[PDB]
Each structure stands twice: as structure tokens, then as C-alpha cells.
Amino acid sequence: MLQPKRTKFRKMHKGRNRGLAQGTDVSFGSFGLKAVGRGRLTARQIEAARRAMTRAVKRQGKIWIRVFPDKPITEKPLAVRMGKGKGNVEYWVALIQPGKVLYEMDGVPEELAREAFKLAAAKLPIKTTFVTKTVM
Amino acid sequence: MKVRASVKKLCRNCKIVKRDGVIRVICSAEPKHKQRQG
């Protein structure tokens, strides 16, 4: 389960996931799973979607994970009143704008790629699409 | 039959039909693949 190995601050503000993404072009691999929708991916979802890819394509191929959490989400326990401090950090999330490449893949066929990204895309909350690395 | 919300073409002989508004997936080989809705 992905998480930052040590941070400056334990608890972070909620903020606002706005604007377009920056990691838009397919840089490393040949193919990629681009996020069409807006949202936020947990540390579990990324692992679950990675496991669904890696197991589909077998030992062969190479996979990247362009997104990383580095945003702690707090949650207040059950049967607890409001106030009396900021809640405890439960899970870690990566904020995903539209256009953001999530996963990238290399060393596999185009036919067998799309099927591997469907299995991952099923695990994720955000609506996704397939993108190929175009030369410039 | 099944009444799942995401019916799909399982085998080769499976065939999609829209009867009375509802989408159904009728099959010749296996009656297991018979499924309604969605």
C-alpha cells in the first residue's frame, strides 16, 4: 500500500481539486490509462488496480504508476461529536484532475493492453480512457 | 435466467434482443447464458 516515507506535516487541509491535469502526455511507456473524470484515488485503489493489470499481462511487460498519494485523509471515529480537534489520518489519496495519466505500460501487444487496462479501470472510481504515446 | 444490470455476450452463440423494452441475451448452446435486464 503506497504511502509517503515520512512527511513534514501529519495532517493536511481539505483543499479543492480543480483545474486540468499536468501529467497528460504518455512519457515512459507505449500505452497509458488517462483519467477522463475528476476525483481522488486512494492508496488501496491504486494497488488494487495495479494488481488487476500486473496479473492480466503476466510476468511479461513493464508498468509505471504516474500517480502517488502524498495527501493524508483524516476521519473522525464513530459516535464522536464535532470539534475537539482535527481527526486522525486513516488513508492516503492522490487528487486526480481530468487529463492525468495514471498508469503506463510497455512491452505488450495493443490487443492485450486494452483488456489489461479495462480490468484496472473497473477498480477505479474515476472514468478513464486508453491513450497511446504519439511521437511529438 | 439471470437479471443482472450488466448483461453481455458470454459465448459465441449468445445473441442480444430487445423484447418489450428489456434487453435480453438469448443463447442456443448453453441455457446458463440466458439473461435479462441492463
Binding site: 486540468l20 491535469a21 497528460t24 502526455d25 488517462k34 483519467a35 477522463v36 481530468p98 487529463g99 480512457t129 504519439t134 511521437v135 511529438m136 | -
Partner: protein, 92 residues
């Protein structure tokens, strides 16, 4: 590898979006001692053109006001998620 393209008159955020929402998109031609030239052109052609690998290497001759200008596609702006072009920088 030949495309007809109109000269731009309105240019900014209001014009560009109005243009983009009309089956076209803005581009620009520049290079050498001459001044740059802002160039409106059709989307559906240039979308089908970029599929070929020669597009981002070979010389294109863009037709403007009768005159055919020789250029190479230097830089390009993809639309974030939808498969469509926003803008092209044509170096001379």
C-alpha cells in the same frame, strides 16, 4: 500534405473558444526574418493528418490567401482528455 487555412482577425480567449467550438482550431506560422502569422484552420483534416508519422518530421505546405508557405510542426497542444487538437506551432 497540403492544407488550406484562413488568416485570423479576432484572437484571445473569446475568439479561440468560439473558433474551437466550430470544427476548426487556431495555429501559428513563424520563422526567419519575417513577422509571425496567426492561422485559423479546419480540425477534421488535421486530426486525420497527425495519424501518419511523416506529419511530425516532413515539410508541410500550408495554403494561405493563395500563397503556399513551407513549414514543419514544431510544437502542438493536445486537448487534455478528449482526442482532439487545440493548437499547432508551425516553424518555418
Amino acid at each position: 500534405f497540403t492544407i488550406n487555412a484562413e488568416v485570423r482577425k479576432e484572437q484571445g480567449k473569446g475568439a479561440s473558444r468560439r473558433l474551437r467550438a466550430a470544427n476548426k482550431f487556431p495555429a501559428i506560422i513563424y520563422g526567419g526574418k519575417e513577422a509571425p502569422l496567426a492561422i485559423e484552420l479546419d480540425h477534421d483534416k488535421v486530426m486525420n493528418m497527425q495519424a501518419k508519422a511523416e506529419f511530425y518530421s516532413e515539410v508541410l505546405t500550408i495554403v494561405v490567401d493563395g500563397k503556399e508557405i513551407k513549414v514543419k510542426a514544431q510544437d502542438v497542444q493536445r486537448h487534455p482528455y478528449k482526442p482532439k487538437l487545440q493548437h499547432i506551432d508551425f516553424v518555418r
